[PDB]
Design a protein around this ligand. Structure first.
Ligand code: BCL
Ligand code: BCL
Ligand code: BCL
Ligand code: BCL
Ligand code: BCL
Ligand code: BCL
Ligand code: BCL
Ligand code: BCL
Ligand code: BCL
Ligand code: SF4
Ligand code: SF4
Lengths: 143, 102, 358, 61, 358, 362
């Protein structure tokens, strides 16, 4: 959308191209939203990252082409911390982080809190996620 | 059952339309506040221990922010029951009738 | 005028079941493109699972027809099962009768369909692949008792032709596709390889000589060929838990076509991913074949489609858009649906996908 | 003018029977698309009819 | 509006005489599918019996055309006869002229037609066979004088091409079916075998070198090919007791087609048994060939037919049914006949049979 | 009476260049309210072709083509870059590289290509008697040396399947044409006069390149034409490198749909007009293959297309013998609409090849 027709402090991350974008796909996502759905270890130590779109029709992999489409501001990748292929103890990490600012009137809101964490690509390290002031990588590390 | 549904407490605006469709006999969906509700401090959650995989919250097609996902039994994460086909778009203006381009 | 009347219905089943009632009727006020008129035909396809242990299904097909006042009939029994993912075996017998002539045949044939590529890049990227190139390899052993004088004369003539004429392997394709069948072969993307005859012989059977023909042929497609592009989709033997029957026919006089078809078979609804089922992608061979005969007259169409979803199921992205949702059943009529019906009657293969979930 | 409009409407109906026009999209969901377009058209026609009534009912005729 | 005027008249002969006066005028207000315009053509066909004891008939066909202001002419005289039920021999000569260029030619040819089968079960159980697959084995010996410089240039080019290139036997089919003739090959179900060249040579003729090309080929059909499925019917040598005439021709511009056809020849109506005569089953290759060009503009049809029977002859079982009879002739116009005419103008081949007797 | 309407709208403009130049601006907008014959819908495509003259010393032109498409929410893309030159009147040589991407998958390629065009005859009698020879039977001989880095696991799988298929099956040489022309592409071969000969695989050898294994494909094929094919009959006229004195671009794209097609075409290239004798120039004869290819897909809905054509001659030029006749002329530009021109538009949209030639001179 044109800069002069948008809310003043809008970055290119939130400025959408394809001027009629909202009706081409889901209107919630300015850019196509992909989810890390599985990260398994088979044969060698390398893990197979599975990028299933929010539409849920395909089962893709990071790949140089989608990496380029990421670093060109066209797609976004999230992990859904409830992912069962996690390495860090997200259930304890989410709970003890909500205990700083959440009062359990329901006594179970913190327990069942799940959120998405975005994934970015530098280059030297692959698809890496920055979580809790530390930069984890999907390759090893974060899984 | 399978195909658990979940709520992302990162897109959810707490509207509770998902809670309206959850069966009262299973309080799967709830509220957490952590602050004032004028700033989105009323997110919703899905109690996976109480959720019985109704599809009611997701198949109702009312989540405005795409927080309901319905992870598929194998690994697939949906976001909305059907998604438009991601079309290439352009403006069609004719040459010297109807429009004149320029 | 030449108005085209047609009513289609789809009564689906929910859950893992892919079954669906398909009954349609059609009226066309146009002359059929048959050089022999009038032509009437009745077809009854009945299938029941013989032994669900390893895939035997008994498929029966009776083709009763009357074309220009000659009575035609073709019954064929066949026990068809999949030995593996890509190989199928059929054992059975049949009969064909024209006028007062009738010869009974028995066969033991195996069809091997091979896709040129099995790339995971295409499979994982394209969620709904339509075109899928490949070949099938038909290995057929058909036996016919030679009791009629006409049968013995045919057998002797064929033996002499194969012995003398060396070009029989590719000249049989001219005889084997009667009239416009040969043109339809290329229209639909099909092409037949030269047959190879592994042996012809006769022996004293239960009552007389029998003509045993061990022959092989293979045909390949560019993607439209629905026998090849979708090999396991056309033969849902795994999801056949009860007998399936299809009764169809048409009364095609010199001034109109009167189509009637019934149906009850699995594979009507296929999963499209993301908990979203769909009506099975429309076969392309029927559309591209009827397009050669459906382009001969300008016609108005009032086509109505019933799609009765199961209890609780809802259609999402019906395109062309449905007219009137009524409880759990849907209607298509006029507008883009009439345009699409004309498009597929004249020869188009435009997509009309009905995605639906619960 | 009833006879004049009878002739005009008959000729126009002949033309649109032999040359139907295309709004295209109203053909499919005419239950809501064509209905709503005709509803706003009738609304404008009805405002126009109110204006015609206001002007005419004050005339000497 | 694209209106297509057309009137047809057939005047039949009494007794067993199968002759008939055929005239037809057409005026189509649509652009022709000709990449070069304006195109015109005048065709004259002359036949005369010279000795029926051995079966010789002298046929002369003259084609004149002016396409894009280029004058074309093709005169062909030939002496054709049935040597046997399947073989014919023609000893003829002619010329072709384009602009200022023109080369005369002579030829002695032999075309033999073989049907794949001769089953009695088919001949008797089908009252009116239409689809009869088979092969025709053309064998042509043409001697063309090499008088012009371009003539010898073509000659050396061709002989060098056949000597050097090994794929001449099938690329000659690509050259030889110029334009959409190659597509019309498959539309009618035809197939051309590799041409067999038995020798190319020259000799010192009466006035110059005469390139003698002895070649042969074979074209096969699926039953639609009228030259194959109607081998005896298309060449009524036996029932030619007087010279026959066909003087057709079309005037075509960038904005319409005008057709004038006149004909008088035997075999117009063929016997059907029990004193019943039917108009010959409509030629099928012309219909399916005009179909490739008759589907480009939507047209309104006002076509009239006039079947004039001799004294004492009446019709029975016409479909589409005639409108008006005058106790001596029958008339078709509009109604279902309009559907059939649009059908056959767009390439449809529906049966419109006329059974008449006394 | 009446029939189904299914109207279609289209505008065409031709802006010719003055002098002896064959250049001309070509733009065409179109909208059809009929379902396309694509079994996967919607199928949107955007096309960009650009050519610039590398050097006039030996006629190399830098040609690029970007095909970016989406079919059923599958984002397809295929980019090519090529340096093509006519080293003689019958042989063409091209060297260049490109890539194709579909969804996640993507693979690049670099090709050394040589195309040789042989007519079956070059008789002078035809040349001196037919002022406008349309049909011209001939053979095209393609010799392609394409190298593809096998970096993806799918590329290595494709190589392993192909090299195992070629050595194990002797029918590969002709069965490759079934995969090659996917779906209607095979059927459209015969209805355009094309004949694809068996490809000869001169060898599939893999060697390590700059970054890893590089699948090398040295294969030749030859496609023959009945004179009906433009890539053979009009081979010299479709590559105006001699008349390319400035960069030429053609940007097109269609928005196919479930109930319609929208088309944009923008072009600027030489060869828009050719000569006809005595200072009489004509718009180039319409290519045969696009007409008879859209014909086998554009005869499924009855339509009454309203089309307007605009031809803007250069200053001092006047149209002589426009057929069908132009509907109006603004003393410098000519306009076609309805009458016999709309009939010809429907004719060519359904696949007809009715000659609509425009001749002009100063
Ligand atoms: C003007 C446009 C008209 C139109 C004009 C025509 C015309 C004209 C014709 C038809 C014909 C047909 N039309 Mg229609 N038709 C229209 C609209 C419709 C509509 C509708 C709106 O609902 C319907 C249902 C139909 C339906 C039909 C069928 C009843 C009929 C073709 C029978 C067929 O399938 O045989 C299937 C044929 C074959 C498969 C035979 C195969 C023969 C070859 C030699 C065998 C190959 C080998 C074989 C495959 C081996 C099998 C072995 C087993 C696999 C083991 N039409 C439009 C409105 N239609 C045709 C007809 O039959 O008329 C009587 C015809 O001529
Ligand atoms: C039609 C396109 C391909 C073709 C594709 C297939 C496919 C696909 C299959 C075969 C199979 C076989 N083929 Mg084959 N085959 C073709 C041409 C032939 C020819 C021939 C003379 O042309 C012959 C003799 C054969 C012979 C054989 C037998 C070995 C066997 C089927 C026997 C049987 O089912 O009988 C009974 C005959 C029929 C049932 C006639 C009805 C056929 C039509 C096409 C079925 C329409 C189904 C309808 C749309 C919905 C059905 C629902 C009802 C519940 C059934 N094929 C053409 C070229 N062939 C089958 C096999 O695997 O054997 C191991 C198989 O699955
Ligand atoms: C796959 C084809 C079906 C079949 C379908 C028909 C049909 C349809 C008809 C006949 C008809 C007849 N059948 Mg039968 N018929 C079959 C098997 C046979 C066999 C045999 C040894 O297997 C014989 C001798 C015959 C004999 C006869 C002919 C003498 C007779 C009329 C001529 C005709 O055109 O036939 C057609 C001949 C064939 C299609 C097959 C001929 C087989 C030859 C003798 C042996 C195989 C040769 C070769 C290896 C197979 C090539 C592939 C075939 C072309 C499919 N049939 C097979 C099972 N048959 C006619 C009839 O019934 O009433 C008039 C007719 O209209
Ligand atoms: C100038 C007249 C107005 C109009 C004024 C009304 C009024 C007033 C009423 C309807 C009513 C109805 N109209 Mg109405 N209606 C018009 C044109 C349309 C069109 C269209 C153009 O496509 C449609 C689909 C309808 C459809 C309908 C249904 C909602 C309903 C009739 C069935 C019923 O239950 O009783 N109207 C025009 C625009 N219509 C009735 C209703 O229930 O609406 C909810 C009603 O009271
Ligand atoms: C919109 C639909 C219109 C229609 C649209 C068109 C269009 C469009 C066209 C025609 C064309 C034709 N139409 Mg029409 N036409 C319609 C209705 C009619 C009616 C009628 C109602 O009565 C008639 C009489 C015609 C008549 C005609 C023919 C005069 C003409 C084709 C010439 C021809 O056949 O040469 C036959 C040509 C060949 C056989 C040449 C073959 C060349 C090859 C290389 C040689 C092959 C080898 C050869 C067989 C060897 C033979 C050797 C001998 C055996 C010795 N049309 C319908 C109503 N018609 C076509 C035409 O020519 O227009 C000028 C054309 O483009
Ligand atoms: C057309 C379909 C088949 C074909 C089927 C036949 C048939 C059938 C016959 C021949 C015959 C001949 N063919 Mg052959 N043959 C074809 C293509 C060819 C070609 C070529 C370059 O394409 C050539 C050189 C030949 C060569 C020849 C000579 C060997 C021979 C005599 C030529 C002739 O009579 O000319 C004369 C040219 C004409 C008369 C021009 C008119 C042609 C059209 C098709 C006739 C229409 C007749 C009209 C409908 C009604 C006429 C009635 C009046 C009484 C005349 N054929 C095509 C492939 N061929 C004849 C033969 O047997 O010779 C021994 C014969 O009977
Ligand atoms: C069956 C075809 C007819 C014929 C019909 C035409 C037509 C139609 C045309 C010409 C034209 C010409 N003819 Mg001639 N012509 C024939 C026989 C010959 C012979 C020969 C040795 O027999 C020669 C040297 C020529 C010479 C010439 C060419 C130099 C000239 C323009 C090139 C062209 O396209 O022609 C094509 C030539 C042919 C199709 C036959 C070529 C025969 C070759 C030279 C010898 C036979 C070799 C091979 C066995 C033949 C295979 C099948 C043939 C393709 C039919 N003709 C036979 C009698 N000829 C053109 C003209 O007259 O004015 C421009 C033209 O439009
Ligand atoms: C299309 C009909 C024929 C064909 C006819 C030609 C012609 C003609 C040529 C080639 C040429 C090439 N062909 Mg080839 N070729 C075909 C099929 C193939 C196939 C295949 C898998 O099917 C392959 C791999 C090739 C391979 C090649 C390379 C050897 C070579 C250069 C490719 C390139 O630069 O891209 C170029 C492609 C594009 C830029 C994409 C756009 C393609 C379309 C056809 C261009 C439309 C132009 C538009 C109408 C006007 C553009 C004007 C603007 C100024 C650009 N061909 C088909 C069978 N081929 C070229 C050559 O000679 O190399 C030596 C050449 O001139
Ligand atoms: C000439 C065609 C273009 C090309 C255009 C495409 C297109 C379009 C697609 C692919 C796609 C893919 N490409 Mg690629 N691709 C080419 C060259 C190659 C080569 C190679 C050694 O040269 C390889 C291994 C591959 C590998 C792959 C397949 C593994 C993959 C998905 C299956 C598919 O359909 O393949 C297609 C395979 C081919 C068309 C050529 C395969 C080459 C083989 C291995 C070597 C040549 C064999 C033979 C001598 C040449 C045959 C010519 C072809 C039939 C045209 N490509 C050339 C440059 N490629 C898919 C994709 O990108 O995303 C899904 C797809 O849709
Ligand atoms: S419907 Fe969606 S946005 Fe609304 S409360 Fe539920 S999860 Fe949050
Ligand atoms: S699936 Fe059922 S139980 Fe679970 S959150 Fe949704 S409505 Fe509640």
């Amino acid at each position: 959308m044109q800069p002069q027709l948008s809310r003043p402090q809008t970055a290119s991350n939130q400025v959408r191209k394809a001027v009629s974008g909202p009706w081409s796909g889901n209107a919630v996502h300015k850019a196509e939203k992909y989810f890390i759905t599985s990260a398994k270890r088979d044969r060698d130590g390398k893990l197979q990252i599975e990028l299933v779109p929010a539409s849920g029709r395909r089962k893709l992999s990071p790949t140089p082409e989608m990496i380029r489409r990421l670093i060109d501001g066209e797609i976004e990748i999230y992990i859904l911390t409830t992912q069962p292929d996690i390495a860090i103890d997200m259930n304890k990490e989410i709970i003890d982080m909500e205990n700083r600012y959440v009062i359990d009137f329901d006594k179970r809101g913190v327990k069942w809190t799940m959120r998405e964490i975005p994934v970015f690509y530098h280059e030297g390290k692959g698809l890496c996620v920055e979580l809790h002031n530390k930069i984890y990588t999907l390759d090893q590390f974060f899984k | 059952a399978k195909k658990h549904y979940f709520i992302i407490e990162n897109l959810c605006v707490g509207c509770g339309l998902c809670l309206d469709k959850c069966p009262p006999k299973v309080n799967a969906i709830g509220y957490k506040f952590y602050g004032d509700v004028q700033e989105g401090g009323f997110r919703c959650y899905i109690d996976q221990a109480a959720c019985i995989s109704c599809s009611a919250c997701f198949s109702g097609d009312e989540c405005p922010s795409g927080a309901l996902i319905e992870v598929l039994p194998d690994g697939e994460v949906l976001d909305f029951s059907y998604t438009p086909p991601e079309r290439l778009d352009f403006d069609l203006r004719f040459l010297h009738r109807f429009h004149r381009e320029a | 005028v030449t108005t085209a009347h047609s009513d289609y219905e789809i009564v689906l089943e929910g859950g893992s079941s892919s079954w669906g009632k398909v009954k349609a009727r059609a009226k066309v006020n146009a002359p059929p493109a048959s050089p022999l008129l009038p032509a009437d035909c009745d077809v009854k396809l009945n299938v029941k699972p013989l032994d669900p242990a390893k895939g035997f299904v008994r498929i029966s097909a009776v083709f009763e027809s009357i074309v220009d006042s000659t009575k035609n009939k073709l019954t064929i029994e066949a026990d068809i099962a999949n030995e593996t993912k890509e190989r199928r075996i059929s054992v059975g017998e049949g009969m064909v009768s024209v006028g007062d002539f009738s010869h009974t045949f028995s066969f033991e044939g195996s069809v091997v369909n091979l896709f040129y590529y099995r790339s995971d890049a295409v499979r994982r990227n394209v969620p709904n692949p339509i075109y899928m190139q490949g070949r099938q390899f038909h290995d057929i052993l058909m036996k016919v008792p030679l009791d009629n004088n006409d049968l013995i004369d045919t057998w002797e003539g064929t033996v002499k032709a194969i012995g003398s004429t060396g070009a029989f392997n590719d000249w049989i394709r001219d005889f084997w596709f009667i009239g416009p069948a040969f043109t339809a072969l290329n229209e639909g993307g099909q092409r037949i390889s030269r047959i190879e005859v592994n042996g012809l012989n006769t022996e004293s059977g239960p009552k007389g000589p029998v003509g045993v023909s061990r022959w092989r042929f293979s045909h390949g497609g560019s993607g439209m060929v629905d026998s090849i592009s979708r090999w396991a989709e056309l033969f849902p033997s795994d999801k056949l838990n009860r007998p399936a029957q299809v009764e169809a026919g048409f009364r095609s006089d010199s001034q109109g076509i009167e189509v009637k078809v019934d149906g009850e078979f699995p594979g009507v609804s296929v999963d499209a991913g993301g908990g979203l089922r769909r009506i099975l992608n429309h076969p392309l061979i029927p559309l591209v074949h009827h397009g050669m005969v459906g382009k001969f007259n300008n016609f108005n169409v009032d086509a109505q489609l019933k799609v009765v979803l199961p209890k609780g199921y809802k259609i999402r992205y019906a395109a062309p858009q449905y007219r009137s949702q009524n409880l759990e059943e849907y209607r298509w009529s006029g507008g883009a649906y009439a345009r699409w019906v004309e498009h597929v009657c004249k020869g188009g293969v435009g997509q009309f996908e009905i995605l639906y979930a619960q | 003018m009833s006879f004049v409009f009878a002739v005009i409407f008959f000729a126009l109906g002949i033309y649109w029977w032999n040359n139907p026009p295309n709004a295209a999209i109203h053909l499919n969901d005419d239950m809501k698309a064509a209905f709503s377009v005709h509803l706003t058209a009738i609304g404008y026609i009805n405002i126009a009819l109110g204006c015609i009534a206001f002007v005419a009912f004050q005339q000497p005729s």
